[PDB]
Amino acid sequence: KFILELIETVYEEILDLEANLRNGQQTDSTAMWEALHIDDSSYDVNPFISMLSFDKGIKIMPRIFNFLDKQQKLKILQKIFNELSHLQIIILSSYKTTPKPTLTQLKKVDLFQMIILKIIVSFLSNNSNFIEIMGLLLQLIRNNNVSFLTTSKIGLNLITILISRAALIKQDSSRSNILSSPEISTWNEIYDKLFTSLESKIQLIFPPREYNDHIMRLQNDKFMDEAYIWQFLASLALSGKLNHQRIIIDEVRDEIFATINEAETLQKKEKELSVLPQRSQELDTELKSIIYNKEKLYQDLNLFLNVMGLVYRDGEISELKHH
Ligand SMILES: [Cl-]
Ligand SMILES: [Mg+2]
């Protein structure tokens, strides 16, 4: 393709950069940047966006990013948030639009998650200010079916990364009154724009059990791993007013009780395994696995419950006591 040639020239441009890095020369990504075709609108679909559809394109991204400055990194993120709704890996990771992913589609989703989102997190955590997060957030909000996005694992995680970083800086800055009025106001405007794009569709962040089942079989284990769903719920809740929080917890209340029920079932299985005398190692690894799964369900729900000042503990939801 025209995209494989681009990947080879980008790669060569990388090796060049590395030699100059290694030989103590100043680094210049100008040619690497050009080779990505980030501003190129000649084609139906941008060639850098197209490059993200290839495992190889994905796998060289950390080395590309090693040579970019912050302005270049930001520009790349901006490009990604504009094309999000029709970005392949989003379509691939939505249960709506890809209700039965194959193993290789899954591994692709994981690869993108493992590599691209890791880079995005490092970048935003080491190089970002409130206004840049706001802009990325507005941009996502303006240019996508945000709810559709939330049905995607990558899409949701991208929202959570942005939203938790914003909350974090606002928290670190609040301790000494850094952050202007126009910024706190804009965040509450932007937050409320995000919120209202999700209102009444929040539960659609949880995929159908059927879909969960299909995925469990492909990966060979009994494992809802939905931490990323609860992490999103926690961050969404953390930045809302009481009104926002009551709406949220009301909309996901069936999922809260299904998770509690899931946890209670594992707790019962744990008890009946625990009373058995002189177990074999295989029985004991069965027991350790049930315990771990039980604890993960606790910890994942409690992530969200804690933000509402609640805690699930021993079959009960009670008021979280910090003191
Ligand atoms: Cl630039
Ligand atoms: Mg309302």
Residue numbers in the entry: 476 to 798
Quoted from the paper:
The Pat1 protein is involved in different aspects of mRNA decapping activation. Hence, Pat1 is considered as a central platform protein for decapping. Indeed, the crystal structure of the S. cerevisiae Pat1C shows that this domain structurally belongs to the ARM repeat superfamily, which mostly encompasses proteins involved in protein-protein interaction. In conclusion, the crystal structure of the ScPat1 C-terminal domain has revealed two functionally important regions localized at opposite extremities of the domain.
We therefore cloned the ScPat1C (473-796) domain, over-expressed it in E. coli and purified it in milligram amounts to homogeneity. The SeMet labeled and unlabeled proteins crystallized in three different space groups. Only structures refined to higher resolution (crystal forms II and III) will be discussed in this manuscript. Three and two copies of the ScPat1C molecule are present in the asymmetric unit of crystal forms II and III, respectively. All these structures can be superimposed onto each other with rmsd values ranging from 0.3 Å to 1.2 Å over 260-310 Cα atoms. The relatively high rmsd values observed between some molecules result from flexibility of both N- and C-terminal extremities of this domain. This flexibility is also supported by the observation that residues 484-524 from one protomer as well as residues 788-796 (corresponding to a β-sheet, see below) from another one are ill-defined in the electron density maps and hence absent from the final model. The crystal packing radically differs between crystal forms II and III. ScPat1C is organized as an array of 5 repeats of 3 helices stacked against each other to form a solenoid structure. The fifth and final motif is capped at its C-terminal end by helix α15 followed by a two-stranded anti-parallel β-hairpin, which folds back onto helices α14 and α15.
